[PDB]
Amino acid sequence: DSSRRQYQEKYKQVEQYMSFHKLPADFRQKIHDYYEHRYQGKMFDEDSILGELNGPLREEIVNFNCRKLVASMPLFANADPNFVTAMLTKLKFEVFQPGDYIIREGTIGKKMYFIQHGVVSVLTGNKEMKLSDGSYFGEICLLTRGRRTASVRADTYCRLYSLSVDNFNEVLEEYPMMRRAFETVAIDRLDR
Amino acid sequence: DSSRRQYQEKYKQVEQYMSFHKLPADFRQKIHDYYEHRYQGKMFDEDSILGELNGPLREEIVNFNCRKLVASMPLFANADPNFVTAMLTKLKFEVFQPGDYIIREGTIGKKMYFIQHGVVSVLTGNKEMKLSDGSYFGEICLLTRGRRTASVRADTYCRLYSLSVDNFNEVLEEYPMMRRAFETVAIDRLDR
Amino acid sequence: DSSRRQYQEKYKQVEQYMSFHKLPADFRQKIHDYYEHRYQGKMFDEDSILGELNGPLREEIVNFNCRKLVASMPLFANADPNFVTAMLTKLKFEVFQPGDYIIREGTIGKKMYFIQHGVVSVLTGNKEMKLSDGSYFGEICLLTRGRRTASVRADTYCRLYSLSVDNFNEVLEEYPMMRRAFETVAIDRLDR
Amino acid sequence: DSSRRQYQEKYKQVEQYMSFHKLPADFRQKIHDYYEHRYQGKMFDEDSILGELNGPLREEIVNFNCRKLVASMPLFANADPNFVTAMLTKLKFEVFQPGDYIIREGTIGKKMYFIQHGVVSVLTGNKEMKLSDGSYFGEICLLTRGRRTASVRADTYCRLYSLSVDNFNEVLEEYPMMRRAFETVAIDRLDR
């Protein structure tokens, strides 16, 4: 029950923080829902727990939590299992709410995202497109080191895994040939 | 009430610390007032709270807390809202007390400051000048990478937002043309 | 008794974490045993404790904990005691469970391991070999900066001390001639 | 009383830690005395407290705690007060016990020390020399980037302030001419 207690107490700290900065009612309701969707009423010192484990256990855990995400993406499903583990280990779980700008067009992109669950809207000057479970986006800038070619907003609640450009290149340093998978997707999107 | 408790307990740690290092009465009174003005009797693990949020929520919070500061500075008011958010996100809130040397002339400058509320005195060999709400200072060294051209002391209590030279250049890396706003101010001040 | 309490409470956090991610029974049993073997039912803020000490005390502690490991390895036993201390200070204690892949062949190696207690199985295309107390492995890649030449799996429970490639080169920067000890072992293994 | 409580509880964690690693009685007595001399039965989250303050207050505190140390060293007493503050701010308080090797001859030196209180013995092949309150040592390697020219052991309990080579050069980057003070001392010692 110590996990729920930590959540309850922590959220109390949040309410007091929002009250201190006099945040509007609608904004506090948004913060409240984010915490609900993101932690589901439970909190553990994850960093501390995973830090107490060893490489093998941490890799087994991330592989288990991402089993579905993996089987749904040919990128991971047909790849060297060691490549998948290397990738998964670098991912950061993030939750975005409806309407949130995940990626803003024209800005310098330093991360890409894998959709665990949810729907995002991609806008290039017109013609909106949707991406859902099993797809990823934001790879163009990690490859070009340029500026975002489109904006991406969350349509539904989005449970995503982000990957920094540095971690992206680090993993590909060990698995150079996997860069082509990302380039194929980037090329196909740029020629659309 | 957990926010006040944290403050009360933390300040008790401070009193004991000052007692341990045998700090003079006037000095302890100064420390006491700083804590009062800086935290207003409440403390939350801000870093932890903001770290639990996502990019969107953190950006919405800083934009809200700095709404007034922003509208008061043509620098931000007339700029790309994304530039403002990028800037705001890098700021560090700091409180200075009357008489405090914020900037000492002749030293290597590695930060600039935006005045949220308060009055600072700028001294160049003579002719003191005042700056208040809505103005910023310390930009000359961020642009020249040289030495402070004047000293700056807090006149009243000062609620400021500092920006490191590294964060300054990082943001301008994405918004190169905004550097001119700072240069215009630096030029006008150097030619005075 | 505060050390046992910390363990008990921390492990409770683990059980709740594993329950939250719905980990399988066998997996939770594995995690349970790892914690048992790794902490033996006791936990202290080691980093904090050692951080409160000074260089001399920390060096005396690591030398004491590794006295046996040292006397068993000519590498340390016959070396400059200052070299040993420099090395020991960089080691990270790790526990691996039966069947765990400590090193996977073909991957980029960034660490080596010293066996405190346990048996590991080294597999090169065939001909498995065993290494035990007093031996070390993983040195080839720290010297070549290439890819692992063999896989290494824990046979029994393994209590090991790992050394990162950066810490390895850092220590050897001060004790350049000790690199030969590692090269002799790497050469002998590569010519087998 | 919360400062004493933190010490008492923390030291209890230490006793349990030493018991867990089965440290010898004499060693535990040494650890016990170190904690006594170093914290004098009181502990506060100093890093947290100073982190809550601002530049001015932190500088005023370190200047106050080091007032005596400063007036005793012409290096600081006759220097630009801003140079002193810059230096003091980089110092790390450390306590060494009788017989402790502060500096070992022939090793790569990355720090120097200022004696707040205590006596150290400097050994070059023979002719031992003593240094006490108001003196500093270890500057030769910070200037040469070579190897220690002598060993330095604590004679009495030593309350020292260490300065890393990086922080040393950083401060001197802003106060280039102060490097000569250290060179004069290094030259005089090398020609002895």
Ligand SMILES: Nc1nc2c(ncn2[C@@H]2O[C@@H]3COP(=O)(O)O[C@H]3[C@H]2O)c(=O)[nH]1
């Ligand atoms: N340019 C472009 N990007 C798309 C399209 N569909 C999805 N995207 C993704 O939207 C992302 C926006 O940021 P990036 O430019 O880094 O990468 C882009 C692609 O990953 C498309 O049709 N055209």
Ligand SMILES: Nc1nc2c(ncn2[C@@H]2O[C@@H]3COP(=O)(O)O[C@H]3[C@H]2O)c(=O)[nH]1
């Ligand atoms: N040199 C100069 N600086 C001024 C003047 N008015 C305000 N300032 C600010 O005082 C600051 C002191 O530090 P910097 O030289 O970095 O930047 C300086 C300016 O931002 C002025 O009239 N002359």
Ligand SMILES: Nc1nc2c(ncn2[C@@H]2O[C@@H]3COP(=O)(O)O[C@H]3[C@H]2O)c(=O)[nH]1
């Ligand atoms: N190539 C090879 N490695 C061995 C042998 N015996 C033990 N090893 C160790 O197994 C390790 C696997 O990773 P490295 O290639 O870095 O270093 C290897 C050696 O340290 C052997 O016979 N051949």
Ligand SMILES: Nc1nc2c(ncn2[C@@H]2O[C@@H]3COP(=O)(O)O[C@H]3[C@H]2O)c(=O)[nH]1
């Ligand atoms: N070489 C030398 N060092 C001395 C002497 N007296 C004090 N020392 C200090 O002992 C220190 C040992 O480490 P360093 O060589 O870095 O710097 C040395 C000096 O700071 C002396 O007479 N000769």
